[PDB]
């Protein structure tokens, strides 16, 4: 009830960014391994 | 070579009677009646009478049907006798005879089904090609477009399997007549010129008429270099042209730049295509395109030009040439800009580099649109 929604939306932003970044890094590691 | 069945003279006369200004010709009507009486085409007589509201000569039709029935029953009896004991060949001869008679009397469906039955029974590639050529011919008589395309594809497939090359060239002539029919004049010119030395399809038209069609289409589809190196030099087109002063003058006038005489010739060629059965559809496009081509020929070697000079070269007025030129510049065809205050026709003809740049823009834009669409479509 206290400031949760703000924490929640901001964590959602960080989560989306980190997921995209992890996919990018997976691809990039695959290329470097090859 | 092949039987003159169906007499495409009959198609030509039927068309001629169709025109209002040729419905009442006693000579043509009598000629057609003689043709019907000589070949006894009862279904054709009925279809003609129906379309024309012509009084039926019952006295003559009675004996017409009597003879028709007699011949039909005789042919069926011969087929039965052959099939009873004779195997192949004689039965095939009888079935060919049945199909041939049915086509002669003009019965569309009967002759067509008969030719199909003969084909299915026929295994001889030469005879298969004979059958297909007959089917193409009848599809021409009735301008049966779907039948014509199917038969042409069938002939092409059989010929690709391998066949006598006389029949290949015959297919070339048939395709050329068709392409003339459907206003694809370029292929018509190409095939007609290629086969100028191997026209064996006399069932279609006299050799004089084949060359007349070939020249007519060549001067609208080919260019001046090719025109010189095929038409005006060819040994054949010249040897025949010794008996057609009109077409020879028409061609040479365009080529040598006798423009007044060229127009005088195109006037009567308009008529010689309006009266025709295979060209009349595009009788107002061919003349107009040829007018474009002449206008762009005279203007191919003149930075400027006095409208009076155009008139005196064409033996026409000034208002007329002005009208036609403005019209065709509207159409987006010709490359020039008239000036009225002083009668000059100064040319504007476009630059090469800029044209290449513009075409590159257009084509590359098309390709980029496709590549973007394709990139997106993979995921959605």
């Amino acid at each position: 009830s206290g400031l949760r929604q703000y924490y929640l939306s901001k964590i959602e932003e960080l989560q989306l960014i980190v997921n995209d970044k992890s996919q990018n890094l997976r691809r990039l590691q695959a290329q470097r391994n090859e | 070579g092949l039987p003159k069945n169906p007499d495409l003279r009959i198609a030509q006369l039927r068309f001629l009677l169709s025109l209002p200004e040729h419905r009442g010709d006693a000579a043509v009507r009598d000629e057609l009646m003689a043709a019907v009486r000589d070949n006894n085409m009862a279904p054709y007589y009925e279809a003609l009478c129906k379309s024309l509201d012509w009084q039926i000569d019952v006295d003559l039709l009675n004996k017409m049907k009597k003879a028709n029935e007699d011949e039909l029953k005789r042919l069926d009896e011969e087929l039965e006798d052959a099939e009873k004991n004779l195997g192949e060949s004689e039965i095939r001869d009888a079935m060919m005879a049945k199909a041939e008679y049915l086509c002669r009397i003009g019965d569309k469906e009967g002759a067509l089904t008969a030719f199909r039955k003969t084909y299915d029974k026929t295994v001889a590639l030469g005879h298969r090609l004979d059958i297909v050529f007959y089917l193409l011919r009848i599809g021409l008589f009735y301008m049966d477009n779907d039948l014509i395309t199917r038969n042409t594809e069938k002939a092409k497939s059989l010929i690709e399997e391998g066949g006598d090359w006389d029949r290949r060239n015959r297919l070339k002539v048939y395709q050329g007549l068709y392409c003339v029919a459907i206003r694809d004049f370029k292929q018509a010119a190409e095939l007609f010129l290629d086969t100028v030395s191997t026209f064996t399809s006399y069932e279609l038209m006299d050799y004089k008429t084949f060359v007349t069609y070939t020249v007519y289409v060549s001067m609208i589809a080919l260019e001046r270099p090719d025109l010189r190196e095929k038409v005006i030099k060819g040994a054949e087109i010249l040897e025949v042209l010794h008996s057609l002063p009109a077409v020879r003058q028409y061609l040479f006038s365009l080529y040598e730049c006798r423009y007044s005489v060229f127009f005088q010739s195109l006037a009567v060629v308009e008529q010689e295509m309006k009266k025709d059965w295979l060209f009349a559809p595009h009788y107002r496009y061919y003349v107009r395109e040829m007018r474009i081509h002449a206008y762009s020929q005279l203007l191919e070697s003149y930075r400027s030009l006095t409208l009076g000079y155009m008139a005196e070269a064409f033996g026409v007025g000034v208002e007329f040439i002005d009208q036609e030129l403005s019209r065709f510049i509207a159409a987006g065809r010709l490359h020039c800009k008239i000036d009225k205050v002083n009668e000059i026709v100064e040319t504007n003809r476009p630059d090469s580099k800029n044209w290449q740049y513009q075409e590159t823009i257009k084509k590359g834009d098309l390709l980029l649109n496709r590549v973007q669409k394709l990139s997106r479509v993979i995921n959605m």
């Binding site: 989306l16 | 800009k337 008239i338 205050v341 630059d351 800029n354 740049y357 590359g364 959605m380």
Partner: protein, 442 residues
């Protein structure tokens, strides 16, 4: 006899719905929202073939966790007609049946329900369930739920239109658009912009739509289809105002961005509007389209209209407008074709300019079947003012003079154009090599 075939069709559809739910589950688990879009490509085929039996079995098996949703969904569904060979479709096994269903799967099920209630001429119940679904979605907050939410808003709009209550939902769409543009979704934003434009058009409220479009920004990553819809609506709104050329350009972009095979009605719409706008622009649209089979008989009014505009004959224009009048009005263009009727001269003046490099004004008056040459004088001057023609009037001799042709290549235009295209190509490549995923260590 056909009953057995229908039964097999139902079984295969049940398996297919199982497949879509599996795909949604994979997408929700694996942090790949785009993986649902696979689940959301075959909706039209499913809807065109769905059946009550399939719906009953699906809702029975999938909603193992009997919740108020189940009680709200079953009653509308007709029960099997004394089914005896029922296989009791049980997609959820053991733990899966006990555990709660995923928000995305449940949203997709509600979507199939509302679609089926739409195909049948039963709009009230469909609308009820749709409000329930909207409440559900708005209550939650998830990504793949958002991707499905896109089409849920599309279907909410479709039902509200089929009930002719389009106005009443404007605020819901507005707040949904606000939340979306706050949360950084792309497809949802495109969908809600398109729906808002459709709502604004339905009631010919053009000034409000103009403000809205001029203020919001279309996200640059949408589908082909949402881009097509946005482009059509913007083209229509401009054509209704006076910016003809941009309307023409946006429309052609749309027509070039639509699906190739389907959307016969959409192509019809854009083509008729394109014809009208070009005519309004003094050009002549090409005759190739009119004989295309998919638009042959749908444009005969416009075929006659152009035949009239070229050889301008107010008698013929009036005949064609009057006869095919109710139709024009039905299309939603009548106003524009009227705007044409008083501009029939423009085609002629553009023709005169293209054809002639200098003509006396009296010659123009003779050529345009006008009154004293002052009228043609004025029309030409206004034209050159508009920008449709490039020339210069000079009466002291009494002739209007066209401007020469300038060399485009020597300038810097070619460099600019090729630079833009090169940038696009490099971007295509970067995206393309980005899209790769090498999961063999999956």
């Amino acid at each position: 006899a056909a009953e057995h075939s229908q039964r097999e069709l139902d079984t295969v559809t049940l398996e297919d719905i199982k497949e879509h739910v599996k795909q949604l589950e994979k997408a929700v688990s694996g942090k790949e929202p785009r993986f649902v879009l696979r689940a959301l490509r075959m909706l039209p085929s499913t809807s065109r073939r769905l059946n009550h039996y399939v719906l009953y079995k699906a809702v029975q098996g999938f909603f193992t966790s009997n919740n108020a949703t189940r009680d709200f969904l079953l009653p509308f569904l007709e029960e099997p007609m004394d089914t005896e060979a029922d296989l009791q479709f049980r997609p959820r096994t053991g733990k899966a049946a006990s555990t709660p269903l995923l928000p995305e799967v449940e949203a997709y099920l509600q979507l199939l329900v509302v679609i089926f209630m739409m195909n049948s001429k039963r709009y009230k119940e469909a609308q009820k369930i749709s409000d329930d679904l909207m409440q559900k979605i708005s209550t939650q907050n998830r990504r793949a739920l958002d991707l499905v939410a896109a089409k849920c808003y599309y279907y909410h709009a479709r039902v509200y239109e089929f009930l002719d209550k389009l106005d009443v939902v404007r605020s819901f769409l507005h707040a949904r658009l606000r939340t979306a543009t706050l949360r950084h979704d792309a497809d949802g934003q495109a969908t809600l912009l398109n729906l808002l434009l459709r709502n604004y058009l339905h009631y010919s409220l053009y000034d409000q739509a103009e403000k809205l479009v001029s203020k919001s920004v279309f996200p640059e990553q949408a589908n082909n289809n949402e881009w097509a819809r946005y482009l059509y609506y913007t083209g229509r709104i401009k054509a209704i105002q006076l910016e003809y050329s941009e309307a023409r350009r946006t429309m052609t972009n749309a027509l070039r961005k639509a699906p190739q095979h389907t959307a016969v009605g959409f192509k019809q719409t854009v083509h008729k509007l394109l014809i009208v706008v070009e005519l309004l622009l003094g050009e002549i649209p090409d005759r190739l389209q009119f004989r295309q089979p998919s638009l042959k008989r749908s444009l005969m009014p416009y075929f006659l209209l152009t035949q009239a505009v070229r050889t301008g004959n107010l008698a013929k224009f009036n005949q064609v407008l009057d006869q095919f009048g109710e139709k024009f009005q039905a299309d939603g263009t009548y106003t524009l074709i009227i705007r044409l009727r008083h501009n029939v001269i423009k085609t002629g003046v553009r023709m005169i300019s293209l054809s002639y490099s200098r003509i006396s004004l009296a010659d123009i008056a003779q050529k345009l079947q006008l009154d004293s040459p002052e009228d043609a004088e004025f029309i030409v001057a206004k034209a050159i003012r508009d920008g449709v023609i490039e020339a210069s009037i000079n009466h002291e001799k009494g002739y209007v003079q066209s401007k020469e042709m300038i060399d485009i290549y020597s300038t810097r235009e070619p460099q600019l154009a090729f630079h833009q295209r090169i940038s696009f190509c490099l971007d295509i490549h970067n995206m393309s090599v980005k899209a790769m995923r090498f999961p063999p260590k999956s």
